[PDB]
């Protein structure tokens, strides 16, 4: 709900005093790539002529923006380390920036290896220049979470990726979901009503 609402708003509120701009379009262009879907309205972010001219004066979030779709990721992790220094400001803070760097990170890796049926160690090392163990421990933590489909196939040091689709996504989603829902009712539907 945050990006689109922001995205399709323009913002003006009694001389934008709660908007406190030099903040708003930035907040959009680093709230977008969490949930605004990378093909769909990310073009509406980029080729949308309402925001691109006011991030023109804001080159840091600009080079944070066109360093995803242009795959220049040796500057994108640099650009995201900037955001983890201006995470300090906003009072909506702590699991928002830890989760935020988590999902910028995971969306960045999942964007790369999805186009390939096999990902080599040298080309994944080419993403920044981090080498091996950053990708190894980190991606093993991500598949420990199971939120990408890759696996650290060190037998050849080439990462494999097919895609089991989101038919199973639902099942896994709804076990927990269902449980929680019933539990709430289980919290109520006893004598205490």
């Amino acid at each position: 709900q945050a990006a689109e609402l922001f995205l399709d708003t323009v913002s003006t509120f009694t001389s934008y005093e709660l908007m406190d701009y030099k903040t708003f379009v930035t907040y959009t262009v680093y709230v977008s790539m969490i949930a605004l879907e990378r093909p769909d309205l990310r073009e509406k972010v980029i080729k949308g002529a309402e925001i691109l001219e006011v991030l023109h004066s804001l080159p840091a979030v600009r080079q944070y923006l066109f360093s995803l779709y242009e795959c220049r990721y040796s500057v994108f992790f640099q650009s995201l380390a900037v955001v983890e220094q201006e995470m300090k400001k906003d009072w909506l803070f702590a699991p928002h920036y830890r989760y935020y760097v988590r999902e910028m990170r995971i969306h960045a890796y999942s964007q790369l290896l999805e186009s390939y049926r096999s990902l080599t160690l040298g080309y994944m090392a080419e993403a920044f220049g981090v080498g091996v163990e950053f990708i190894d421990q980190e991606l093993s933590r991500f598949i420990a979470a199971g939120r990408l489909h890759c696996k650290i196939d060190k037998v050849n040091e080439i990462v494999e990726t097919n895609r089991p689709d989101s038919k199973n996504w639902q099942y896994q989603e709804t076990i927990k979901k269902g449980d929680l829902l019933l539990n709430r009712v289980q919290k109520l539907s006893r004598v205490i009503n």
């Binding site: 983890e84 699991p95 830890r98 920044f128 220049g129 080498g131």
Partner: peptide, 26 residues
């Protein structure tokens, strides 16, 4: 918040891991 985060164990984040990453490479 109220969607369960990890926030557990991990040493200083992608700023410092970025820093010793590019410094350890170079």
């Amino acid at each position: 918040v109220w969607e369960d985060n990890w926030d557990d164990d991990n040493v200083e984040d992608d700023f410092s891991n970025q820093l010793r990453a590019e410094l350890e490479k170079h």
